[PDB]
Amino acid sequence: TTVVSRTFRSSPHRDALQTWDAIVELLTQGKDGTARSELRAVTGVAASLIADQAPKSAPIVATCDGPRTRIYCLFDEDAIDGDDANEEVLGFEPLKGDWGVSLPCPKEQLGWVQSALKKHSSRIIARDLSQG
Template identity: 70%
Template sequence: MSSTYSRVFRSSPHRDAFDTWKAIVELLTQGRTGSDRNELLAVGGTAASVIAEQAAKDAAIVVTCDGPRTRIYTLHDDDAIDGSDAKEDTLGYDPLKGDWKMSLPCPAEDLDWVNNSLKKHSSRITARDSAESSGSETTKAATGSALVLDTKGFLGS
C-alpha cells in the first residue's frame, strides 16, 4: 500500500478558483513544463468551476501515480482568509510520476457535464460524486466525525 499525502489550498476570496487551480497545477508539476502541465491547464475552466462550487472543501482532489497518493483540499470564505489551515508547501516526490490519474470531486447534479468536459481534454482526469469516497480516500468530514459510545451495549444493560 502506498503512502498518502495531503495539501490544502486557500481559494475564494483569497484567490479566485482559476488561480487556485493554477497553484495546484504548479504543485503537481513542480514548475516543470510539458505535456502533463498542458493537460492539467487544458481542464482549468472545468476544474475551476468544481473548485468554485467548493466541492474540494470536504472531498479531496485525488491524484494517483507510481508513487504516493496525493489528496488536495480547498479552503473557502473565512477559512481561506485566515489561512491557518492551509498547507501549500511542495511535495518531496513527483506526484505525476508514471501513469498518473486524477479524480475531481463534483456535485452530483454537475457530474455528467463535468465528465464530458474533462473527456475533451484528458483521459486521465475524471470527476466523481463528491458525496462518495474514492478508493481508500476518506473525506475530511468523515475523518472529523464524532465517536458515539453505545453505553447500553457497553455496560451490558
C-alpha cells in the same frame, strides 16, 4: 500506499482560476510538459468545481507511481486566515508514471463535467463527491 495531503487557500484569498493554477504548479513542480498541458486544458472545468466548493470536504486526488496526494481547498474566513493551509511543495514527483487526477464533482454536474473533461484527458476524471 503512502498518502500525502495539501490544503490550498481558495476563494476569497484566491479566485477559483488562481486556485487551480496553484494546484497545477504543485502537481507539476513547475515542470512544463504534457501533464501540465493536460491540467491547463481543463482549467475552466476545474475552476467551476472549485467555485462550487467541490474540494472543500472531498479532495482532489492525484495518484501515480508513488504517493497518493489529497488536495483540499479552504474558503471564506478559513482562506483569509490560512491557519489550516498547507501549500508546501511536494518532495516527490506527484504524477510519475501511470498518473491520474480525480476531481470531486456534485452528482448533478457529473454529466457535463465528465463530458467536458473527456475532450481533453483520459486521466483527469470526475467522481461523485457524495461518495467522498
